Scaffold this active site. Structure first.
Site, mmCIF file in Angstrom:
data_model
loop_
_atom_site.group_PDB
_atom_site.id
_atom_site.type_symbol
_atom_site.label_atom_id
_atom_site.label_comp_id
_atom_site.label_asym_id
_atom_site.label_seq_id
_atom_site.Cartn_x
_atom_site.Cartn_y
_atom_site.Cartn_z
ATOM 1 N N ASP A 107 -7.961 -2.928 -7.788
ATOM 2 C CA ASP A 107 -7.599 -2.706 -6.396
ATOM 3 C C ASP A 107 -8.667 -1.872 -5.686
ATOM 4 O O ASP A 107 -9.135 -0.861 -6.214
ATOM 5 C CB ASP A 107 -6.243 -2.003 -6.352
ATOM 6 C CG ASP A 107 -5.707 -1.861 -4.958
ATOM 7 O OD1 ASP A 107 -4.826 -2.645 -4.571
ATOM 8 O OD2 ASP A 107 -6.162 -0.952 -4.238
ATOM 9 N N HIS B 267 -7.390 -5.977 -1.869
ATOM 10 C CA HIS B 267 -6.351 -5.010 -1.518
ATOM 11 C C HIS B 267 -5.278 -5.669 -0.662
ATOM 12 O O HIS B 267 -5.605 -6.372 0.297
ATOM 13 C CB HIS B 267 -6.934 -3.804 -0.776
ATOM 14 C CG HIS B 267 -5.923 -2.740 -0.476
ATOM 15 N ND1 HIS B 267 -5.290 -2.015 -1.464
ATOM 16 C CD2 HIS B 267 -5.416 -2.296 0.699
ATOM 17 C CE1 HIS B 267 -4.446 -1.163 -0.910
ATOM 18 N NE2 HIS B 267 -4.504 -1.312 0.402
ATOM 19 N N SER C 246 0.860 -1.213 0.000
ATOM 20 C CA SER C 246 0.000 0.000 0.000
ATOM 21 C C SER C 246 0.883 1.246 0.000
ATOM 22 O O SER C 246 1.753 1.377 -0.881
ATOM 23 C CB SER C 246 -1.042 -0.086 1.106
ATOM 24 O OG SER C 246 -1.792 -1.287 1.013
HETATM 25 O O1 LIG Z 1 -3.345 2.698 -0.965
HETATM 26 C C1 LIG Z 1 -3.815 3.635 -0.408
HETATM 27 C C2 LIG Z 1 -3.844 4.995 -1.141
HETATM 28 C C3 LIG Z 1 -4.014 5.049 -2.458
HETATM 29 C C4 LIG Z 1 -4.046 6.332 -3.317
HETATM 30 C C5 LIG Z 1 -4.161 6.200 -4.696
HETATM 31 C C6 LIG Z 1 -4.189 7.311 -5.531
HETATM 32 C C7 LIG Z 1 -4.102 8.582 -4.989
HETATM 33 O O2 LIG Z 1 -4.123 9.725 -5.809
HETATM 34 C C8 LIG Z 1 -3.981 8.733 -3.617
HETATM 35 O O3 LIG Z 1 -3.895 10.036 -3.109
HETATM 36 C C9 LIG Z 1 -3.953 7.615 -2.777
HETATM 37 O O4 LIG Z 1 -4.309 3.481 0.909
HETATM 38 C C10 LIG Z 1 -4.214 2.195 1.500
HETATM 39 C C11 LIG Z 1 -5.446 1.895 2.364
HETATM 40 C C12 LIG Z 1 -6.786 1.408 1.794
HETATM 41 C C13 LIG Z 1 -7.505 2.228 0.950
HETATM 42 C C14 LIG Z 1 -8.737 1.856 0.444
HETATM 43 C C15 LIG Z 1 -9.266 0.626 0.778
HETATM 44 O O5 LIG Z 1 -10.506 0.246 0.253
HETATM 45 C C16 LIG Z 1 -8.563 -0.213 1.632
HETATM 46 O O6 LIG Z 1 -9.110 -1.457 1.972
HETATM 47 C C17 LIG Z 1 -7.329 0.179 2.148
HETATM 48 C C18 LIG Z 1 -3.042 2.115 2.493
HETATM 49 O O7 LIG Z 1 -1.985 2.806 2.389
HETATM 50 O O8 LIG Z 1 -3.161 1.319 3.469
#
Ligand SMILES: O=C(/C=C/c1ccc(O)c(O)c1)O[C@H](Cc1ccc(O)c(O)c1)C(=O)O
Ligand SMILES: O=C(/C=C/c1ccc(O)c(O)c1)O[C@@H](Cc1ccc(O)c(O)c1)C(=O)O
Ligand SMILES: O=C(/C=C/c1ccc(O)c(O)c1)O[C@H](Cc1ccc(O)c(O)c1)C(=O)O
Ligand SMILES: *[C@@H]1O[C@H](CO)[C@@H](O)[C@H](O)[C@H]1NC(C)=O
Length: 344
Positions: free
Chosen positions: A244, A290, A145
């Protein structure tokens, strides 16, 4: 179990100024070292970070961390749970900087919080050299993530640091899980702008070649895998679900699917597949899910009949095409769960 060590340099800190750290389980019969970066979103201004401090404080502070953690998935030491690297030296680096592992800014009279993710990684590496890392043959920097994006932002800096410190025999490689996102149009809050604001708030840093392509004020581009990956010199294996859940969340998709949404979802899968066409080491199943690598049943999913632990083993062999040992595994079927092995 992996045991907690707080950093000996206490000026390298979590958001609130408490010391950062790492969890370690040594394997003295092995010259392989796995360093895993935890994920967990980010925060981008004072008000947003204050809210995170109220209800997600372990992601901002080491004050309440436990003394041990259990390694799971790729961090497991049991051959049955981890066919790939069960005998490796295992390190889990908690995410307590809220900056996608990019920050280089201390707490001060002008800064309520410290954003030091890029410095935390370098200090962990330095302190591990005296605990056996100096004898390593392979250092695999992995993450999920925000930690997967962190691998892309930091793997070449780790390689450069070890060269400059005088350790040219350590082969540095990356494994980025669930950190490969598209700056696409939403189906129906501004996710790309939140990254631009965060970089300024954190004093965020990006890899040098990517910085030089995009130039002043455009460093946000380097947080997107398909833009930063072609600039990297270290070998990097990419793991990414085609659908995702975090991508769908930022796209405002919440799942009787009608035609507009069907086309939106099919186009997302096709775009992700396109970005991976020139990524020779990759694993991309057609599932809605995810994260993958630290869950206990990570061995179950297969693409074209090959599991992720096998694909990673084939990647190791390729870094010494191989008969019956593939490394590029991207589903071509166009809807979630068209692969029967998707997580239930
Ligand atoms: O991966 C991300 C962020 C992604 C993202 C993707 C594109 C963007 O422009 C941005 O600002 C953020 O968050 C995850 C968390 C997460 C997000 C959404 C979900 O549905 C989930 O189950 C977990 C993490 O770091 O744990
Ligand atoms: O129906 C299945 C279900 C596969 C499956 C379903 C759930 C799992 O967790 C898993 O590891 C595999 O088999 C596949 C074919 C297949 C399965 C496993 C193989 O090693 C293989 O080479 C082909 C099909 O669609 O015909
Ligand atoms: O292509 C196949 C199956 C091929 C096949 C061909 C001969 C067999 O004996 C057999 O069990 C399976 O399934 C895929 C779905 C699929 C199954 C398992 C996977 O690991 C996968 O990535 C996709 C499809 O229809 O697109
Ligand atoms: C501790 O870390 C800070 C910031 O990374 C650095 O400036 C300082 O030199 C370090 N101290 C030692 C003794 O290495």
């Amino acid at each position: 179990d992996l045991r907690l060590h707080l950093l000996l340099n206490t000026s390298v800190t979590c958001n609130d100024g408490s010391p950062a750290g790492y969890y370690l389980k040594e394997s003295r019969g092995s010259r392989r070292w796995l360093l895993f970066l935890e994920g967990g979103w980010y925060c981008f201004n004072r008000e947003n970070c204050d809210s995170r401090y109220d209800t997600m404080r372990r992601l901002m502070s080491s004050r309440d961390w436990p003394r041990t953690r259990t390694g799971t998935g790729i961090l497991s030491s049991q051959p049955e749970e981890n066919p790939y690297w069960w005998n490796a030296n295992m390190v889990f680096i908690p995410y307590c900087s809220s900056d996608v592992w990019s920050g280089a800014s201390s707490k001060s009279e002008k800064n309520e919080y410290a954003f030091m993710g890029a410095l935390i990684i370098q200090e962990v590496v330095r302190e591990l050299l005296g605990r056996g890392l100096s004898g390593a043959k392979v250092l695999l920097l992995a993450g999920s993530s925000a930690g997967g994006t962190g691998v892309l932002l930091n793997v070449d800096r780790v390689a450069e640091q070890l060269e400059k410190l005088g350790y040219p025999a350590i082969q540095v490689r990356g494994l980025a899980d669930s950190g490969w996102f598209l700056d696409n149009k939403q189906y129906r809050c501004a996710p790309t702008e939140a990254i631009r604001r965060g970089i300024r708030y954190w004093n965020g840093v990006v890899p040098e070649r990517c910085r030089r392509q995009f130039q002043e004020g455009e460093e946000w581009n380097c947080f997107f895998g398909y833009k930063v990956y072609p600039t990297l010199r270290s070998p990097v294996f990419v793991v990414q679900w085609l659908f995702d859940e975090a991508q769908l969340t930022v796209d405002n998709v919440h799942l009787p699917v009608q035609e507009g949404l069907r086309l939106y979802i099919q186009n997302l899968g096709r775009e992700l597949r396109h970005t991976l066409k020139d990524v020779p080491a990759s694993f991309a199943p057609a599932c809605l899910s995810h994260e993958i690598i630290i869950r206990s049943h990570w061995t179950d999913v297969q693409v074209k009949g090959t599991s992720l632990p096998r694909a990673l083993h084939c990647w190791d062999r390729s870094l010494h095409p191989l008969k019956g040992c593939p490394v590029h595994l991207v589903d071509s079927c166009p809807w979630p769960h068209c692969n029967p092995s998707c997580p239930t």
